Coordinates of C-alpha atoms and ligand atoms in Angstrom, one line a residue:
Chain A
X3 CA 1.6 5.4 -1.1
X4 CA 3.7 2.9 -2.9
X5 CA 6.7 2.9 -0.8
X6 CA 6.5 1.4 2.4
X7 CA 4.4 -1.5 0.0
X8 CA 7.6 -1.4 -2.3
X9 CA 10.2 -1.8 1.0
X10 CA 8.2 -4.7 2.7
X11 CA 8.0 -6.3 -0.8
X12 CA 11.8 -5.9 -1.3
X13 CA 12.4 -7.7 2.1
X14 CA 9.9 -10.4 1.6
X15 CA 11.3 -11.3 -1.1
X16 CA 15.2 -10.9 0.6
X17 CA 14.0 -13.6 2.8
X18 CA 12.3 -16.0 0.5
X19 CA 15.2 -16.0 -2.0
X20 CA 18.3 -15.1 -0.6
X21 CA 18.1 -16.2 3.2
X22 CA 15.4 -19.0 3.0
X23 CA 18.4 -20.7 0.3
X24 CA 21.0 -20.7 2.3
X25 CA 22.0 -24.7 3.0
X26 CA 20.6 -26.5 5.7
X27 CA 18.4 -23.5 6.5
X28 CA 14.8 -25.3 7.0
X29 CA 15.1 -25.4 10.8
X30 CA 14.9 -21.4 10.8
X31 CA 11.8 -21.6 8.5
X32 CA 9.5 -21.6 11.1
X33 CA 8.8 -21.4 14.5
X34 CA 9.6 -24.2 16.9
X35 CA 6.7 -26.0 18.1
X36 CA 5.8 -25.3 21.7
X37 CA 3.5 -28.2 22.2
X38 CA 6.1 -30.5 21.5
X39 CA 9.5 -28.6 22.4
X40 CA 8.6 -27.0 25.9
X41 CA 12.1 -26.5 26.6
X42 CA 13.0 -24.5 24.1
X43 CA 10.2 -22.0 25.2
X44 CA 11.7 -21.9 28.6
X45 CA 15.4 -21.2 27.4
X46 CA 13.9 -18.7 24.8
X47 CA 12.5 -15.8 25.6
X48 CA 11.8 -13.9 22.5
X49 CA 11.4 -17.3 19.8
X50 CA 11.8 -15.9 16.5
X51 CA 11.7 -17.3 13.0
X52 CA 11.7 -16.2 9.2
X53 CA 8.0 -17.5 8.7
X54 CA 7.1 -14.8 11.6
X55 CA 9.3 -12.5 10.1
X56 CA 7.5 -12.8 6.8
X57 CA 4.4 -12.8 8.5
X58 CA 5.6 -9.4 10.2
X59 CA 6.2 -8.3 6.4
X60 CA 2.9 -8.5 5.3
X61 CA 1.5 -6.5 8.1
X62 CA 4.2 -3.8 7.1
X63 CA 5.6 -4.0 10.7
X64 CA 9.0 -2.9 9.5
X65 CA 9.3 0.9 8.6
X66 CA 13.4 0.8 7.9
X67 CA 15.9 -1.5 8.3
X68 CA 16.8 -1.5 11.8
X69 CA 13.8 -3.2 13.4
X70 CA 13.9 -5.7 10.7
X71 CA 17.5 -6.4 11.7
X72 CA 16.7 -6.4 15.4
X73 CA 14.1 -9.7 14.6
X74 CA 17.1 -11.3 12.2
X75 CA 19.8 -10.7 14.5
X76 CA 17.2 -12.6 17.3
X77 CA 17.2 -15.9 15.1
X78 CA 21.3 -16.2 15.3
X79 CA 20.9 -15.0 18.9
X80 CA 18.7 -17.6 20.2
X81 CA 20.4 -20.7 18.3
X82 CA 23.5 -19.4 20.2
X83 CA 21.9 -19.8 23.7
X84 CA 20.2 -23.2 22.8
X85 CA 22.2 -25.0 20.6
X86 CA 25.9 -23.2 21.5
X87 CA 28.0 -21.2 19.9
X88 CA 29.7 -23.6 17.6
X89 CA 26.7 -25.8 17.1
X90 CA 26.1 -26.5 12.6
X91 CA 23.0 -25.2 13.5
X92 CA 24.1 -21.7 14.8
X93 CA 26.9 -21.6 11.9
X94 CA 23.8 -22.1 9.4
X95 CA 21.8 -18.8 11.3
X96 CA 25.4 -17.1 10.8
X97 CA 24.9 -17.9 7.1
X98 CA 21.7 -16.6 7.4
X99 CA 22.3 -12.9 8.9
X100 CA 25.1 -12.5 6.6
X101 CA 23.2 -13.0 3.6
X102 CA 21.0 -10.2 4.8
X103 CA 23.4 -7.9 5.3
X104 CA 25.1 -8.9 2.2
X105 CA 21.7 -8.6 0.6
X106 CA 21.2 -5.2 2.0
X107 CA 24.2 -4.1 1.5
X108 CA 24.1 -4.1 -2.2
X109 CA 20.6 -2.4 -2.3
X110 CA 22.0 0.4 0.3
X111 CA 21.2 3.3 -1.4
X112 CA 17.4 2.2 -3.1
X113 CA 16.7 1.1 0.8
X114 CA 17.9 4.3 2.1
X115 CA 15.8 6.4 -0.4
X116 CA 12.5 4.1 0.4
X117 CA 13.1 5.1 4.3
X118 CA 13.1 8.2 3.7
X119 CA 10.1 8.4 1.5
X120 CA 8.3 6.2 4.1
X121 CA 9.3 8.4 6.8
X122 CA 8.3 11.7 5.6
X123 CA 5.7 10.1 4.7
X124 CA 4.3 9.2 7.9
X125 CA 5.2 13.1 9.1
X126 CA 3.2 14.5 6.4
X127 CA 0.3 12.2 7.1
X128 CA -0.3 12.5 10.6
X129 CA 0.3 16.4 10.6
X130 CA -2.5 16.1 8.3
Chain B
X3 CA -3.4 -12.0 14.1
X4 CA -3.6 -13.1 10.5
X5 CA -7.1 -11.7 9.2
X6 CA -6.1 -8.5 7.7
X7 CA -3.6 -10.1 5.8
X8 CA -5.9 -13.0 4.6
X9 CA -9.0 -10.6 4.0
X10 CA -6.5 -8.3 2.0
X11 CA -4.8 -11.3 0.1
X12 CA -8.5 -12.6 -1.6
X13 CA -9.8 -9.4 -2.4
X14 CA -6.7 -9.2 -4.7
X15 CA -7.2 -12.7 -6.3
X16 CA -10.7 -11.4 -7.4
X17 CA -9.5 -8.6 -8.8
X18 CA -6.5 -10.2 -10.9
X19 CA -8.4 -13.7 -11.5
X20 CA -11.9 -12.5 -12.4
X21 CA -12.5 -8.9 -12.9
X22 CA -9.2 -7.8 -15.2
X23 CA -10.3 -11.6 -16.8
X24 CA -13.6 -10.3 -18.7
X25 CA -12.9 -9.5 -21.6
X26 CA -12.1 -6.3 -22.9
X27 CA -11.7 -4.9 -19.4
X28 CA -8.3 -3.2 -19.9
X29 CA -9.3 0.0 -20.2
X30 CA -10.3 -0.4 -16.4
X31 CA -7.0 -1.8 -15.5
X32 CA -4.7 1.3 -14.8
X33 CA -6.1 5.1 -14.9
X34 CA -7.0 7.5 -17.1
X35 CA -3.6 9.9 -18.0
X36 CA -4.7 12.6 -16.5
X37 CA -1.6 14.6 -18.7
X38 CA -3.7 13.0 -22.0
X39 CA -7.4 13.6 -21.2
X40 CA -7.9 16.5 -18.6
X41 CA -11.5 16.6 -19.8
X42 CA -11.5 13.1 -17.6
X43 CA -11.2 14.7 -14.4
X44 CA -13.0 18.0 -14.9
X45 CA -15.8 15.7 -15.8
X46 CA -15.5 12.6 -13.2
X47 CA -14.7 14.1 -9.8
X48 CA -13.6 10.5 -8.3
X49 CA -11.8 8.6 -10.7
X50 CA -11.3 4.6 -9.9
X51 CA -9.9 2.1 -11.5
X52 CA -8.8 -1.5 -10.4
X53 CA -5.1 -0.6 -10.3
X54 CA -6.0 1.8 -7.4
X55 CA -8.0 -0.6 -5.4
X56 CA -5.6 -3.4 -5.8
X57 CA -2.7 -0.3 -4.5
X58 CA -5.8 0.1 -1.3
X59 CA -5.5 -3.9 -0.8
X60 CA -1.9 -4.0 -0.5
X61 CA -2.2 -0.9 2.3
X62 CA -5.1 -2.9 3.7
X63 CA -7.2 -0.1 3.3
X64 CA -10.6 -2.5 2.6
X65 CA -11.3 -4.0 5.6
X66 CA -14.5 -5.2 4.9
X67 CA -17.0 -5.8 1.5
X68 CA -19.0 -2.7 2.4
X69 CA -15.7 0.0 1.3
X70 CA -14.8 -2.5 -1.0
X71 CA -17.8 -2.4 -3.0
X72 CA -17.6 1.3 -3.0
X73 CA -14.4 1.8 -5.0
X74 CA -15.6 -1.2 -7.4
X75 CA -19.1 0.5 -8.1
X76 CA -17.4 3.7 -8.3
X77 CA -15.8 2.4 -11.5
X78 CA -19.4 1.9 -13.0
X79 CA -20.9 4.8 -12.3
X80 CA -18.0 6.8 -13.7
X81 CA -18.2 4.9 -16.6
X82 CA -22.1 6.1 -16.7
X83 CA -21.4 9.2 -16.5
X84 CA -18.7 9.5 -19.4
X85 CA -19.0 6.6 -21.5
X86 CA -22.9 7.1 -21.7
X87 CA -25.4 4.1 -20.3
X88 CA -25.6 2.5 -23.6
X89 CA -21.9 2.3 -24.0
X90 CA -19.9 -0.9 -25.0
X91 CA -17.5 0.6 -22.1
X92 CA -20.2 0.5 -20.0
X93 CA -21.1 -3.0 -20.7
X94 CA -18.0 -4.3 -19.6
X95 CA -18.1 -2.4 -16.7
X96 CA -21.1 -3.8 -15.5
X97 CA -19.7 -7.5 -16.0
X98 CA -16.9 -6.4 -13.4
X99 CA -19.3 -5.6 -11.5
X100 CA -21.0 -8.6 -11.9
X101 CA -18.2 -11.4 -11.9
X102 CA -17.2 -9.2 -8.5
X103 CA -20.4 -10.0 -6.5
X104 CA -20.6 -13.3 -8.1
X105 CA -17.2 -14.3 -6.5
X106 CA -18.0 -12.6 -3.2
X107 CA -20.9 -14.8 -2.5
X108 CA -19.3 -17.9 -3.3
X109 CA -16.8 -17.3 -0.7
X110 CA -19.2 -15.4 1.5
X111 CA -19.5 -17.9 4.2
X112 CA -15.4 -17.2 4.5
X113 CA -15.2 -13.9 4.2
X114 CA -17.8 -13.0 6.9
X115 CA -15.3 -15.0 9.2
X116 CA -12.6 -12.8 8.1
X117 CA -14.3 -9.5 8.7
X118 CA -15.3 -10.6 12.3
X119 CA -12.1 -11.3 13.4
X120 CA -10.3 -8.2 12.0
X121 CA -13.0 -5.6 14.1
X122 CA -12.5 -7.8 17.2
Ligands
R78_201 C1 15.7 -26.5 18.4 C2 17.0 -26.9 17.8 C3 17.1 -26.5 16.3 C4 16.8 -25.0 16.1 O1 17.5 -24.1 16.5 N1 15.6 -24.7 15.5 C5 15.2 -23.3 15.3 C6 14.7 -25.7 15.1 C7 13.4 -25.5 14.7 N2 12.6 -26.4 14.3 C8 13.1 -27.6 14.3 N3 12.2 -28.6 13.8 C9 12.3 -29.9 13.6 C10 13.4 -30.7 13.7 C11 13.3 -32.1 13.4 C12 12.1 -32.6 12.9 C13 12.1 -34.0 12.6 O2 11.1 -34.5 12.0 N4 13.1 -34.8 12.9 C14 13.1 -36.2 12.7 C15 12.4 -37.0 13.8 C16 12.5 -38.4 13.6 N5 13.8 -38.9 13.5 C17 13.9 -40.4 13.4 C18 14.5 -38.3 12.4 C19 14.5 -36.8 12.6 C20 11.0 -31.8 12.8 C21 11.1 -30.5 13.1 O3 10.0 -29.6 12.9 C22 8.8 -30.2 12.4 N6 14.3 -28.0 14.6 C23 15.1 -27.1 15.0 N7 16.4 -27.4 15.4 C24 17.1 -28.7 15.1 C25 17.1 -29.0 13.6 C26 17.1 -30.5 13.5 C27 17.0 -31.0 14.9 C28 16.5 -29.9 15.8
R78_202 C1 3.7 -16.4 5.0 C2 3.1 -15.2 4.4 C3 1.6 -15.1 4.3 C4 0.9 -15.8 5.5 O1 0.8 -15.2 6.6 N1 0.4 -17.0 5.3 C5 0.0 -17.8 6.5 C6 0.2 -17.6 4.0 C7 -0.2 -18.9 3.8 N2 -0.4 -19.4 2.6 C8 -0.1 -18.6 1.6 N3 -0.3 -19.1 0.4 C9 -0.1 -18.6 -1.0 C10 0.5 -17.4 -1.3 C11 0.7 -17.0 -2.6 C12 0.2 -17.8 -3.6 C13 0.5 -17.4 -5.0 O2 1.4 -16.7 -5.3 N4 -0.5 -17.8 -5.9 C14 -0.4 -17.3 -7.3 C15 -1.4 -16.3 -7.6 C16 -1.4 -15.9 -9.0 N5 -1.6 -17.0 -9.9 C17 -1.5 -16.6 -11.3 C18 -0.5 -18.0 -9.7 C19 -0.6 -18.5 -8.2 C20 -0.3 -19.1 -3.3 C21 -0.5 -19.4 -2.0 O3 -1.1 -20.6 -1.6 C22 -1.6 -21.4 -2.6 N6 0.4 -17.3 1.7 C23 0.5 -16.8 2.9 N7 1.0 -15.6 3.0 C24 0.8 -14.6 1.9 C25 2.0 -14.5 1.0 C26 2.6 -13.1 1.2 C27 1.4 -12.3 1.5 C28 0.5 -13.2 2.4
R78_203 C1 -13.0 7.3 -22.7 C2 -12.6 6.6 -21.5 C3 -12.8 5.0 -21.5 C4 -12.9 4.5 -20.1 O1 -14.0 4.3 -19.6 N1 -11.7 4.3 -19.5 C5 -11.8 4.2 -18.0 C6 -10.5 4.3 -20.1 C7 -9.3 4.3 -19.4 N2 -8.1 4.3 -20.1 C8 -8.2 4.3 -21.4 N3 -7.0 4.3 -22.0 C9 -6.6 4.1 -23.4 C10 -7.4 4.0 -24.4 C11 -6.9 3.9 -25.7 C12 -5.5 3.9 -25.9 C13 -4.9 3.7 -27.3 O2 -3.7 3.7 -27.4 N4 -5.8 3.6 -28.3 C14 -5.4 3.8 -29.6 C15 -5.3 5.3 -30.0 C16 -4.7 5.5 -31.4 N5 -4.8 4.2 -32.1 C17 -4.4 4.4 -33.5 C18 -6.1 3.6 -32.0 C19 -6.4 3.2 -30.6 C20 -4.7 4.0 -24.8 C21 -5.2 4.1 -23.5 O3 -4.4 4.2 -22.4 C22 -3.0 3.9 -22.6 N6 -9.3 4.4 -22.1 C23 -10.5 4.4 -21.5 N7 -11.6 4.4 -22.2 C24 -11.8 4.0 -23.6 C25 -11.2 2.6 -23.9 C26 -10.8 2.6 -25.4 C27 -11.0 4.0 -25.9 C28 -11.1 4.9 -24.7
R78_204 C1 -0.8 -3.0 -7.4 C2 0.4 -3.9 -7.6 C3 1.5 -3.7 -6.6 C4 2.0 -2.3 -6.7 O1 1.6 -1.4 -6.0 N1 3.0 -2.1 -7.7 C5 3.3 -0.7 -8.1 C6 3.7 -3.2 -8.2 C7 4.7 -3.0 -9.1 N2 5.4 -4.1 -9.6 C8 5.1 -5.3 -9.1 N3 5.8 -6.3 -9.6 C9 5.9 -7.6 -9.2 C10 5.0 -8.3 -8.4 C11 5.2 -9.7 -8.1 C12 6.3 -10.3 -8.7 C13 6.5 -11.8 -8.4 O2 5.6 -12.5 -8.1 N4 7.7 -12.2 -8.5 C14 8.1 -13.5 -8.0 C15 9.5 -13.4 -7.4 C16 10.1 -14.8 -7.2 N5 10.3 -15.5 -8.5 C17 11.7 -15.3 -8.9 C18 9.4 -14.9 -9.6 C19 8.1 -14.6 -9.0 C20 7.1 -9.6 -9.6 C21 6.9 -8.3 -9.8 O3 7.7 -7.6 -10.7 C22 8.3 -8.2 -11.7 N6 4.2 -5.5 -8.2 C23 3.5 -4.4 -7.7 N7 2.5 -4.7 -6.7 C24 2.7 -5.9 -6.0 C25 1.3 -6.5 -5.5 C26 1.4 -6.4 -4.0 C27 2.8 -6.6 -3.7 C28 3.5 -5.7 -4.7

């Protein structure tokens, strides 16, 4: 029961201390707002930030690493379509994914164990 | 979408800010070692304790009061059963109990909100 609480608690906190304190990182805090910044909406298709991804968090939406990466990776991707590749903006979301990896990197092999807990976990379950 | 979330996030403020703060409520803070006192669970066939619900909140298992209550007033009538109705164990039970309620309706204007919104 405790590990898929344990994993989203691990990346919660990932985000609030490690990526969320990068320099110059409060633009990727939260989401752009549509009712004032219509053309970003247009340009972007799939608008991501790290308040959504923490909101995502809560809900336990990620199971493992992967999909969490694929909403990470999403933040760099879209600051390179709108504000180009060698914008400060887009070197400060490059900051931002590497500190993840960095970050997950160095807690590879607890990740990896909590994945697989979580996953048998789910077989078990539903068999039942 | 964030009911569940908010629903799930007060429940666990009453538990840590009221009902583990009457005093002498410890023992009903974590379970009984099942390794240390068997006779526990050949006598109470549902143990509870507010370690578990507080593990159900973080699932999101509660998703309304009414299953809530259940786990909470579970904790009571186990101590009944064990401790005796006249314990000192069982007093302090009853003021979780209590304090639990108390806070519930305070914020029950809010919470009925809450519980709307997560069933639609
Ligand atoms: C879309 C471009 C880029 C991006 O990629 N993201 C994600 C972004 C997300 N959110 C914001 N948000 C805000 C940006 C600026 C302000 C603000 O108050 N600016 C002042 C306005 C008055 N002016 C005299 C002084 C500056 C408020 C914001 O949200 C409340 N900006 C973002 N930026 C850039 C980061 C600074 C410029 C725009
Ligand atoms: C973006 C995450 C999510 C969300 O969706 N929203 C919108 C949100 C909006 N506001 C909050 N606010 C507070 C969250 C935590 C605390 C807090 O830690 N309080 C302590 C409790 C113990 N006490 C001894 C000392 C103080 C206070 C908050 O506001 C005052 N949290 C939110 N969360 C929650 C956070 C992770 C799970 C859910
Ligand atoms: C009978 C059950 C009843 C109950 O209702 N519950 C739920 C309960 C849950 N958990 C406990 N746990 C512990 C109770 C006492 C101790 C402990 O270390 N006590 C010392 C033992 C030796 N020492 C020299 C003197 C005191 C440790 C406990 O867990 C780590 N006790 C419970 N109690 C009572 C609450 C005080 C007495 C027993
Ligand atoms: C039933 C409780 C539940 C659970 O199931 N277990 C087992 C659990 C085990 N350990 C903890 N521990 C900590 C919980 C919060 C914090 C904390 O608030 N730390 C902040 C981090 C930023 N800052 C530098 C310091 C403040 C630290 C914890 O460990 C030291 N929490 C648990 N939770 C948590 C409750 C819902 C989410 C997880």
């Amino acid at each position: 029961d405790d590990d898929q609480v344990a994993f989203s608690f691990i990346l919660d906190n990932i985000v609030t201390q490690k990526m969320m304190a990068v320099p110059d990182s409060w633009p990727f805090h939260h989401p752009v707002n549509k009712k004032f910044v219509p053309d970003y909406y247009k340009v972007i298709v799939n608008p991501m930030d790290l308040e959504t991804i923490r909101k995502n968090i809560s809900k336990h939406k990620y199971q493992s690493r992967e999909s969490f990466l694929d909403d990470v990776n999403l933040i760099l991707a879209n600051s390179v379509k709108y504000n180009g590749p060698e914008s400060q903006y887009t070197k400060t979301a490059q900051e931002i994914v590497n500190v993840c990896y960095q970050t997950l990197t160095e807690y590879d092999e607890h990740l990896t164990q909590l994945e697989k807990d979580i996953c048998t976990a789910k077989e078990a379950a539903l068999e039942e």
